[PDB]
Amino acid sequence: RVSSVLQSLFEHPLYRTVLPDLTEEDTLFNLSYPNWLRFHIGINRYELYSRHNPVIAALLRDLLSQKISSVGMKSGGTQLKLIMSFQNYGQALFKPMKQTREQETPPDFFYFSDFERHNAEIAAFHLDRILDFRRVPPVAGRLVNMTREIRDVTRDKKLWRTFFVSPANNICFYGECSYYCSTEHALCGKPDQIEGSLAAFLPDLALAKRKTWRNPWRRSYHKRKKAEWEVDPDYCDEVKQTPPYDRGTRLLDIMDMTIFDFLMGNMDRHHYETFEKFGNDTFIIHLDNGRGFGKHSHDEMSILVPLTQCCRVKRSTYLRLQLLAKEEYKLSSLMEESLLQDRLVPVLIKPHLEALDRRLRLVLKVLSDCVEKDGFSAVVENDLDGQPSV
Amino acid sequence: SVLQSLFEHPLYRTVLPDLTEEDTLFSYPNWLRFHIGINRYELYSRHNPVIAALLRDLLSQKISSVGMKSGGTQLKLIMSFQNYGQALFKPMKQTREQETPPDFFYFSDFERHNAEIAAFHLDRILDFRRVPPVAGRLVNMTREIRDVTRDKKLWRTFFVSPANNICFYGECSYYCSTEHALCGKPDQIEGSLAAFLPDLALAKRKTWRNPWRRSYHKRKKAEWEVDPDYCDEVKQTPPYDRGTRLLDIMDMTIFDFLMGNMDRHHYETFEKFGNDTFIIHLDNGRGFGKHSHDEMSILVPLTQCCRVKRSTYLRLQLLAKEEYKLSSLMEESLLQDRLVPVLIKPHLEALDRRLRLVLKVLSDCVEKDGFSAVVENDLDGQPSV
């Protein structure tokens, strides 16, 4: 028996935050179901699943071992991403292994040429859960027999067409997308298991409209052309006076996400989604994290710029960030503790967990330098009145 | 409302680059707010309530002066309004049930106002935003045409037909005679007010020849009509191997094929921006003349060049799904003009049938040059699907 670094964290009062009382709204759905459906009705205005909730732990197990019954290909997608639909009518999104565990993105790669890797999708779910955001839909890693579980169970002529046997006698496939869907970029098992991330599926858009927002620090997905925030140091004085960003719980929720993204090095956060039925006053669904954890010896400061320009965070997430730096807690050991509960262990190589620590204290220094320029209270909003003390 | 569902889909939430001091061409009047909103990439915005309100001005603003556009194929009038902004007026030359005869050449075809209107909505549904706004309008040809002109050459052509109806024909070339007059029943004619682009004094326009321009003569075929490898060389000639230009011609040539408009002999740009802007899809009046015939000659630019934008390809596929699809989305927005029905039902169904031919021309072309070689990617950094 061993002591859990993760057990100490979830006992701490900064992780015993209670939500407001939920009315008839704030629920998305009126109301022994499958675990994927119990996850859907558990979605409310503030979070995506809530703390603990043994459904999420058991829903991650369903993604691991439920029989894959049908597979289809998201046509016209960003890169190759598959849709797995299971025996219990719930489905999931599948991103296969594109890069090895030791690899880093080349330095000369643009953010829009980067590979999407299953390690980030998985690890982002755990990192977000450890920061008590609870905004990433649950995702479990899975080894898939790419013959019986991908090719032989699809009636999609375009995904089936790309399966071949390489001169190495391995089974390969690549589908038909835009980035890295060619014979020279095929995905080959050794010889017939490929590995990938099964991301639980958010409720069908028929019964849960989702507003898609532009985020104001969206990069100029062009070379030789900088974006507005890249030239104007007072860019956020103007964004906090623009509609949806002067009323929340919104600039502060973007500061949560933009600290999330910096910790992983994910600079491809050009949009964020909301649940619409709740309005301009709900949380940000942290989706599409596939671009993180590509570089571990490099910290991308561009992502933090929203924080240096806007200069305000939530108090809840500020003290947790400070707690995630204390040696008795701290991202690194708190992350491989959870990340060991996936089948794909190690889902993050040891230098990437080490990079979480270094990037974290850069966030604390950007807040300390920024709290030492606008003063407290102007920088740190207070969402802890009526919450466990410290 | 099927049109409500379309503009919620992410393929219609494309965002622009940040606009610099350039990329801009420049309680105002609505036509002037339309001018200053013209930028490098588009001509308006997906509301932008100015555009919708500019069509109401074209419908019901008081006509203050009318002039005659000299030397045209047919009659076109210049209506200038109470607020000094003007528009181009094309009167009704064809009824709704008529089709262009089969023995007609593309260069003998009439311009009909219903096509000018429907082309604007079709273009807005393809998220192009390249056609100047146009609204349909019934004009009392006494109070709003004859009695408010100081061009005696236009006023002189008003007469009374043996049927006690009010007629006029103007003075152009070849279809401006007593036998081609436009007669109300008894004094309303109906026509299309096409909004006017900014004056060329303060907004120069370069006009380009397109390489698939037909040889506007009988017997003589054009260059691209004999060489199936015509575009192997056209993508190596100056202006067409740098854009966003070949890609913009494929946008325009898919636009034109959908309407059957085979009279696209030239296209204009705004110059102030250079070789790197959008193509203003102007004067689309030759489309929607035939609904029982799909003119494949228009598509040859697509089979020869074999490349589209991914932006417009995915929308083309979307406009084919039964939950969206051109037909119902077109009569919905064509129901918001005064001239209802501006498109007869067989013409809207042909919009669907012609679409599935374009989607077939790309799939046959995407499985022979492959993705990436055929479909350029401009959706990096745009909303996911």
Numbering used by the authors:
A (entry chain C): 131 to 161, 198 to 556
B (entry chain E): 134 to 159, 198 to 556
Give the authors' words.
The Fam20 proteins are recently identified kinases that regulate essential cellular processes by phosphorylating proteins and proteoglycans. The human genome encodes three Fam20 paralogs: Fam20A, Fam20B, and Fam20C13. Here, we use a combination of structural biology, biochemistry, and phylogenetics to elucidate the molecular functions and evolutionary relationships of the three Fam20 kinases.
The human Fam20C protein crystallized but the crystals diffracted poorly. To gain structural insights into the Fam20C homodimer, we crystallized a Fam20C ortholog from zebrafish (Danio rerio, drFam20C), which is 86% identical (94% similar) to human Fam20C in the kinase domain, and determined its structure. These analyses, together with the biochemical results described above, suggest that the human Fam20C protein probably forms a similar homodimer, and that dimer formation is critical for allosterically activating kinase activity. A comparison of the drFam20C homodimer with the Fam20A−Fam20C heterodimer suggests that Fam20C uses an almost identical set of residues to interact with itself and Fam20A.
